[PDB]
Amino acid sequence: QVASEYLGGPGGDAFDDKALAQNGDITRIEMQCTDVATYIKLRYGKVDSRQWGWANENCIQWSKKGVKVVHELSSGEYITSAIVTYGKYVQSITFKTNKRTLPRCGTSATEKSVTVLIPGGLKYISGRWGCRIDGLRFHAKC
Amino acid sequence: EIASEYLGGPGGDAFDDKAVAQNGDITRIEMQCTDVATYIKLRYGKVDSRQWGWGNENCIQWSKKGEKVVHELSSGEYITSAIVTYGKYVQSITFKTNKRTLPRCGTSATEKSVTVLIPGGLKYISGRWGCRIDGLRFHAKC
Numbered sequence: 001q002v003a004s005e006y007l008g009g010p011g012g013d014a015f016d017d018k019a020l021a022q023n024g025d026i027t028r029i030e031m032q033c034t035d036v037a038t039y040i041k042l043r044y045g046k047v048d049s050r051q052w053g054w055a056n057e058n059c060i061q062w063s064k065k066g067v068k069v070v071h072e073l074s075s076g077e078y079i080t081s082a083i084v085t086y087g088k089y090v091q092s093i094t095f096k097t098n099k100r101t102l103p104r105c106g107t108s109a110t111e112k113s114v115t116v117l118i119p120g121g122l123k124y125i126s127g128r129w130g131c132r133i134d135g136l137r138f139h140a141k142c
Numbered sequence: 143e144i145a146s147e148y149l150g151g152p153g154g155d156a157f158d159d160k161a162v163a164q165n166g167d168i169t170r171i172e173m174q175c176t177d178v179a180t181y182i183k184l185r186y187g188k189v190d191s192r193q194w195g196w197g198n199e200n201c202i203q204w205s206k207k208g209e210k211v212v213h214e215l216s217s218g219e220y221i222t223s224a225i226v227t228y229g230k231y232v233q234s235i236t237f238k239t240n241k242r243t244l245p246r247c248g249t250s251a252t253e254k255s256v257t258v259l260i261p262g263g264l265k266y267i268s269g270r271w272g273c274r275i276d277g278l279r280f281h282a283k284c
């Protein structure tokens with residue numbers, strides 16, 4: 001399926017929810033948010049991905065941790081927009097659905113911004129992760 | 143069928159390529175390019191739409207004109223994304239296909255920017271036009 005460009009840096013390890021996304025539509029957005037977004041974990045059908053970020057509790061040496069944010073999506077709700085501020089890492093993530101405008105994960109939004117529109121709805125994410133979110137890519141449904 | 147949101151302003155006159163697009167998959171992109179994109183004209187199979195933009199040579203009394211640019215797509219190449227800068231009008235357009243990022247039409251990219259994913263590839267465009275491209279909507283195969 002069509003995918004955005006990769007937004008972020010070379011750090012961390014690669015992840016790709018392509019296979020996980022066979023479990024279903026995105027039904028839930030889980031992130032950890034402070035001045036930056038430190039992990040993301042989407043639910044496909046009833047199955048969470050692994051926690052893409054905040055690799056271990058000693059990561060607190062290099063950024064704050066943040067609070068766990070959960071946005072449950074209703075059936076027929078899908079993500080149609082992502083605003084990402086990024087540089088070497090993802091800084092902040094603001095999702096919108098076809099029903100809702102979700103709050104930004106990451107209070108700082110000073111890094112360069114990109115708005116990615118996903119008509120028909122996001123299918124899954126890939127990117128790179130470690131103590132935080134090194135980068136994100138958005139994959140459409142076709 | 144899935145279509146992006148309308149990007150641009152309320153000016154000019156509506157156009158829609160749904161009917162012409164029954165002549166085939168998009169085979170080439172024609173545009174006119176200065177600091178801004180002043181028209182767009184796609185070819186559906188062997189059949190071009192009308193010129194959507196630069197309505198009159200007297201439009202030069204308001205904006206620059208630009209030079210004609212043609213991008214021929216190879217068989218099986220499809221348009222997967224468009225970086226659009228826009229406000230009152232479309233300002234610049236950078237198309238990408240499943241095989242390549244193409245040159246931007248419009249050297250000025252200073253207005254609000256948006257990266258539109260086009261799931262399954264672009265099927266046709268709609269929007270509004272006059273002396274310039276007042277707005278665009280991207281109709282995807284999915």
Ligand SMILES: OC[C@H]1O[C@H](O[C@H]2O[C@H](CO)[C@@H](O)[C@H](O)[C@H]2O)[C@H](O)[C@@H](O)[C@@H]1O
Binds near residue numbers: 058059061129132133
């Ligand atoms: O505490 C372990 C390491 O954490 C940081 O580095 C990791 O996290 C970064 C952000 O996700 C990645 O870019 C990087 O590749 C990971 O190794 C910290 O910078 C390191 O000093 C720590 O060893």
